[PDB]
Amino acid sequence: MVQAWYMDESTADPRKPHRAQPDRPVSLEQLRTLGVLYWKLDADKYENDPELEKIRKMRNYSWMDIITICKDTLPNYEEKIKMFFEEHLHLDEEIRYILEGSGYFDVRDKEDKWIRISMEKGDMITLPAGIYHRFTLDEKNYVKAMRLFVGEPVWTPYNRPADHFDARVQYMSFLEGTA
Ligand code: NI
């Protein structure tokens, strides 16, 4: 089952797990209060999976592509990696389905504390527009993921502070309505 936790207070080595001590696990239910949704799929079937198709149709994820993040293949790797880990939001959902490898999506909770979400092969996550988040590889330094989008993609991050945007205002308003 998918693992998430509150993070420790170290600012060193972002690819390490950084589990708070004592452990403070976070459930899928708590993640849903933040608008973060999750599905488990068989990643070997990704090119032809009726279960993925059900999700995509339901959620209007009409666009997809495949990205591989690793030292060798990725162009402008060191720069991209730096940017992905800067705390930011998007004006649209961020949807990723992990096909091989793994990494961490960190998201802010309702008290603005960091939760780290460990994503592995078969895990699919959507982070809602307006949520402050960031991404890093873990210590294995490799991920292959499908990126999905509602319509034609815009990837632009807005590094925090990005509080003026309507997407952020609406996300905040969503947060008042959950547990
Ligand atoms: Ni992002």
Q: 85 CA distance to ligand 1 centroid (A)?
A: 9
Q: 114 CA distance to ligand 1 centroid (A)?
A: 15
Q: Is the peptide bond before 128 cis (omega within 30 degrees of 0)?
A: no
Q: 157 CA distance to ligand 1 centroid (A)?
A: 6
Q: 42 CA distance to ligand 1 centroid (A)?
A: 24
CATH number of the domain bearing residue 20: 2.60.120.10
d(Cα 116, Cα 6) in Å, to the nearest integer?
6
As to burial, measured by CB atoms within 10 angstroms (0-12 exposed, 13-18 middle, 19+ buried), residue 84 is middle
d(Cα 80, Cα 68) in Å, to the nearest integer?
12
Structure-block tokens of residue 78? 């060191």
Cα angle 16, 20, 22 (rounded to 5 degrees) comes to: 135
Beta strands in 22-142 (DSSP E): 37-40, 63-69, 88-89, 94-108, 114-120, 123-127, 133-137
Known binding residue 164? Answer is no
Q: 139 CA distance to ligand 1 centroid (A)?
A: 20
Q: Is the peptide bond before 22 cis (omega within 30 degrees of 0)?
A: yes
Structure-block tokens of residue 157? 């991050």
d(Cα 70, Cα 149) in Å, to the nearest integer?
22
Structure-block tokens of residue 161? 């502070």
Where is 144: in which H helix or E strand? strand 143-149
Where is 93: in which H helix or E strand? none
Q: 70 CA distance to ligand 1 centroid (A)?
A: 17
Q: 117 CA distance to ligand 1 centroid (A)?
A: 14
Phi-psi label, residue 15: left if phi above 0, alpha if psi -120 to 50, beta otherwise: alpha
Q: 58 CA distance to ligand 1 centroid (A)?
A: 22
CB 103 within 8 A of CB 140: no
In the chain, after which residues does the backbone break, taking C–N over 2.5 angstroms as a break? none
Residue spans of alpha helices (H) in the chain: 28-33, 50-59, 77-85, 166-177
CB 26 within 8 A of CB 5: yes
Instruction: Give the determination technique.
Output: X-ray
Q: Does residue 75 sit in helix, strand or coil?
A: coil
d(Cα 117, Cα 112) in Å, to the nearest integer?
15
DSSP state of 161: P
Structure-block tokens of residue 32? 């849903």
Known binding residue 88? Answer is yes
Q: What total number of domains does the chain contain?
A: 1
How far separated are the first and last CA of the chain, in Å rounded? 22
d(Cα 56, Cα 148) in Å, to the nearest integer?
8
- Domain of residue 63: give its range: 2-179
b/e per residue 112-130 (b: at least 16 CB within 10 A): eebbbbebbbbbbbbbbbb
